């Protein structure tokens, strides 16, 4: 059955979600909410840039600048090693 649950990818996916929740929780609240709403980690629905800007009360260029800075912060190795081994 070449399309079954491989029983180690499921537990690896659960540990990946746990580690991603940890690394996202070690940030600022506004940046973490922006990243979650941008990549759809809340409820599986990705949100638009103007939608995040509307619900957080700032402009879209401010939102995308905060997103770029937060993506740099996550790309930094100090936060990035424990997720670098997963991929």
């Amino acid at each position: 059955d070449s399309e079954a649950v491989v029983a180690v990818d499921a537990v690896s996916f659960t540990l990946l979600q746990d580690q991603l929740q940890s690394v996202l929780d070690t940030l600022s609240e506004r940046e973490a909410g922006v990243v979650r709403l941008r990549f759809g980690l809340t409820d599986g629905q990705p949100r638009t840039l103007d939608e995040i800007g509307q619900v957080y009360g700032v402009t879209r260029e401010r939102i995308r600048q905060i997103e770029s800075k937060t993506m740099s912060k996550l790309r930094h190795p100090s936060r990035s090693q424990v997720l670098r081994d997963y991929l």
């Binding site: 180690v8 537990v11 690896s12 540990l15 409820d43 599986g44 629905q45 424990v82 081994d85 997963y86």
Partner: protein, 1270 residues
Amino acid sequence: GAMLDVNFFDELRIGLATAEDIRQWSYGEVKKPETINYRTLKPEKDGLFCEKIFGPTRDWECYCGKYKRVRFKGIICERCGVEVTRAKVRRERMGHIELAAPVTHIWYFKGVPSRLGYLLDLAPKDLEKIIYFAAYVITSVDEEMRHNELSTLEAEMAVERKAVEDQRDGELEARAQKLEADLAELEAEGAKADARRKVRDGGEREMRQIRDRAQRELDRLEDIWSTFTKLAPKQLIVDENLYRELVDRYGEYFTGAMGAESIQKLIENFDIDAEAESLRDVIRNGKGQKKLRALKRLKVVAAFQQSGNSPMGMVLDAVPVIPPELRPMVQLDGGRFATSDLNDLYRRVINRNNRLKRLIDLGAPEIIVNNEKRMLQESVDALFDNGRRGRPVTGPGNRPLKSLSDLLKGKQGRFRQNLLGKRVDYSGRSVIVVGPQLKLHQCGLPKLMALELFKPFVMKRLVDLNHAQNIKSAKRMVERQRPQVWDVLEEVIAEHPVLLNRAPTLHRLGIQAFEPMLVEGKAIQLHPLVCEAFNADFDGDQMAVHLPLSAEAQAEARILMLSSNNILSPASGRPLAMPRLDMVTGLYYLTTEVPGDTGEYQPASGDHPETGVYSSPAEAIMAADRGVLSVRAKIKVRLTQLRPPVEIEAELFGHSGWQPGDAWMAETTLGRVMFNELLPLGYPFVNKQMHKKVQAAIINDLAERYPMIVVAQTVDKLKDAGFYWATRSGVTVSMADVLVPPRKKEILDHYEERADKVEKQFQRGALNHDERNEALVEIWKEATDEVGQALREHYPDDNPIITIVDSGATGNFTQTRTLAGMKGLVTNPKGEFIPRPVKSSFREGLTVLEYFINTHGARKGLADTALRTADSGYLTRRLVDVSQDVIVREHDCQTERGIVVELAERAPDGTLIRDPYIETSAYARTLGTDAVDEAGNVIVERGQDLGDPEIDALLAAGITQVKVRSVLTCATSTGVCATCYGRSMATGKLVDIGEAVGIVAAQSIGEPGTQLTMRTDITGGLPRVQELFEARVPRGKAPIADVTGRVRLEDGERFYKITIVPDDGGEEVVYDKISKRQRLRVFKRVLSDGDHVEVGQQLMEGSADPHEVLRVQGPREVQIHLVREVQEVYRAQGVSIHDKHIEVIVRQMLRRVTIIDSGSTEFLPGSLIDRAEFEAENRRVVAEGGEPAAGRPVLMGITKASLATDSWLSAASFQETTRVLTDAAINCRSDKLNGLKENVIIGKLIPAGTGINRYRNIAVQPTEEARAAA
């Protein structure tokens, strides 16, 4: 009932599905015979695989693509139609097919007895002709319109026949005028006298055939009127022309039809209550064939009457469709497809149904439409059961397709291939080798298998020790086998048992749980003392290793199933971890004594003292390490740490020699001292020679007096010393150690003369062709025995071959006789003895003809041993299925019943001789009443275990009978009690209150197959056991007496005839056709005329049938008879089974009674009901008005008593799956899941062992003082 299948079960009720249940299960109607589009591979709309009906293929992803998230859940895509949910609902959703004409179920029409035929009272050959479109059937008829139109229509019929007669007399007058014209034109022509009259004779012959044709049409009209005047429902009409004539002349007054629609109309016009009243009136009044027919109809009519079922579910309007994940279409590697043969059957049904809808809505003649309906009926029949009526539907290559019923039956069905035996994870195989340095609780496990078995544990541990960062890198490290993983693997393998199992698993000691350790290699190193339990050689045999995961499973494998907790065999109680053959040769050499060896004690004096004594076994061992003392020479040591035997102890120290300290002198060898240092400290000094029976007695005494850890450690020490002294024993085989006897030529000549004289007398003609065969066979049997005796008295006592045989290690003496001496006689493909014989031994070398003769018997023995294991497996299967519901439920039934036990019958001169079969009849069962001796006190009180000191005390006090307590008289309702079972043979204590004693009994009986040889027309091997447990009538059926009296022997032609004259002046009883070969029975004297016989004396040699001895001498004497006849098959081959393992099977045959008089309560005569249900009904019914139903005991075999059970789920998985399911459906039977095989199927805890409520609800908490002190 709920259908979510969460584990809250109480019942599992099976019924008969109606059409309004089928179109309430279904999720939509499949109406095209399409499966998958050929180019894009997506499931077609309204086909057999349609996503709108059976759910979507992709998880939370609809078809057209409009909704694709978990956010949309349970929504219906308004363009395409598929709802959005998981893709595992394609194994849980069914569809249905709407048939354009009704179709009968094949199960309720074809399988004998035909339930439709019994319900409608139609013969099967007159029912197949209806439902397969060959004969019409009158569904209904009018009565009063028929009554007055009888007069009017017979007036019209007489008028029509009168007009026919008017045309007939027109024919008469026309032929008369034609003959008168022939008279006018032939009365004046001059010709011959007959030629002028042969034309008139031809005209009269034409008149004769005209009136013959008139008779033919008048008989046709008479037949039409007769079959109208005798018209009734359920009456077949063949001759479509005749039915057509009845239809167009008499279109009123009746309705007729043809097929499953007519069957449905007859089922609708049917009154079950009035039919049942008529049937019960017949069974109350009439007799014979009509009464038997009414009973067999009343079975299914009462089944349809008592419940809320209706008979209308036997015809169908909507076939259901199995979900598309159970008949998958799977694409292989490279575009090859694979379907599951059900799509062809469903496609044929859907094609023929669509074509029938087209023909009906078009308007077609009856021949075409009836052929289409017959084709649709045959398609649905081939779907439900292929190859039941006619030819099986074949695929490509001419193999029959696999229909729905073929998924369920046989060894390849669901019930036997996937529900009872499954493949498992965490398992592996290898090939076993011998591990003689291991302890008894250890096994060697190769590291490459142990890594793959313990991979998740080692992944967790090497993540936690920071050798890796996560599970993915840890798995990569394990699969690349980097060298940290062995240091982790040792620490995760410490103290974690595994189960080792070797197929076949004949008895319960074939699965045992060792504690593993790592071994550099690829072979599972096994201990050499568990090979007898596993039945394992090392010729390449393979063993399977499982692995317990949960805490309960590890506790079970550590406590219940550990290797050093199963020393004794559960069948007889003999030890199975006893040393065998190699340690036996070692210990026999160590403890034997040679007279006149080196350093022997000799009391010769006058000049010097004895010079044989020693001051300690340390000094003796030093002298034996020098070249002075042999191990097997008689000395006088001075022991200080070995407990003396009882006589020397009572002589020297009297009572309390505290054997750590005291000193005493023993005149033994040194080998016996070194043997007794292995036994425990309190065990007395043995001082014997260790034959294998002596070692078995020592280990049995140890297991009954000491703890099991002491027995296990002692058994390991015996193994070590046995191997070490087996090496130094000088046991080798050479060609000079096989000595031939020196008188074999003289013995063979002396018997050759007698054989030559017998053959010369046959050539003279004084004896026929068979008497010389018997004489030659007897002569050569005597010659074989004489050669064996000469060999036995010629061989020295210290030969290697005779030491191996005499120490009980291996072999018997007949193998030594054929090795040196004489092979003897040999068999035939028929089985008789070829009277040649084989006069050469395998040391001298057989010749060409003797070798070719010997090959017959050798190959027949090999083929018989191939067959006998399958036969024993089948017998064990049936015994397990009968006795699966005998588990221990209480501690005391508290009855006062019990059987009697023979216990060392009296001698004629006057003394007590011990009965030989006392270790399998009287040991290890509780006393029922007290033992009182010849107006005396109690010797053994009631309730004792009756072991060896109790038996010795009883035989010393001089009593012969005891009333012992047995499971045939256990008075609990469900399962035996525990004091009635006695001690468990495998532990030595009383049996526990969850034990599965029925399965232990069945495996203990069925395991000594493949050592029950038949012979060399009474059966005497394995088929003697099968025809006892099945309770068949035997082959050599010897009759028994029916009343005490005098035998009046009569001798007819070539055989006998016996009529017993009763003493009480009763009716004479006659047995007539008792054949020639049955010789008369001999007791004490041959049965002569005028002899005296008892009520149950067997009259001839052979085998009494067990039904007859039950009918004469009550239910007790058939329990004596069945146990005695089974045990004489096992005792002939030296196999010990305790009798409490046969009484568990025997008590499960006599559970039921047969009804002779119904009385007033719902019990049809000839039926078999349980006795506990019978007596509970009689107490309820004869209260407030006495109408007791009368019942007789019955004895039924182990195949009827396991199909007539109370659960339809345990019965269907045994045997006859189609027949068991097809009448559990009619009765609307409910299963309660109380069994031990129903719980295995549905996957919950069995109700025996640690799965009962006494043990499963234990509350464990720390105590008060240890909670405080931490």
